[PDB]
């Protein structure tokens, strides 16, 4: 399965709230299901986009990136 790594991705700052929910529970569930350590960046952090910042295994990574993704389609229409 390979070494725990590190990846970024970015959210427009007006779609981020897709992936955080009430008290955080989305973030918490998304965590939860790919196993992955996710946080997110602070909200003036500037740019057009906020940075979510991924860790885990490759596996991990990406099973929490199309968590994000689909969560952002679920509540957004559209992905990132």
């Given at each position: 399965?390979g070494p725990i790594i590190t ?10 709230g897709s992936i955080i929910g ?59």
């Amino acid at each position: 399965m390979g070494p725990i790594i590190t990846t970024q991705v970015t959210i427009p700052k007006d779609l981020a709230g897709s992936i955080i929910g009430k008290g955080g529970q989305r973030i918490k569930q998304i965590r939860h299901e790919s196993g992955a350590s996710i946080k997110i960046d602070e909200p003036l952090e500037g740019s057009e986009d906020r940075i979510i910042t991924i860790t885990g295994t490759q596996d991990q990574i990406q099973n929490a990136q199309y968590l994000l993704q689909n969560s952002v389609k679920q509540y957004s229409g559209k992905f990132f």
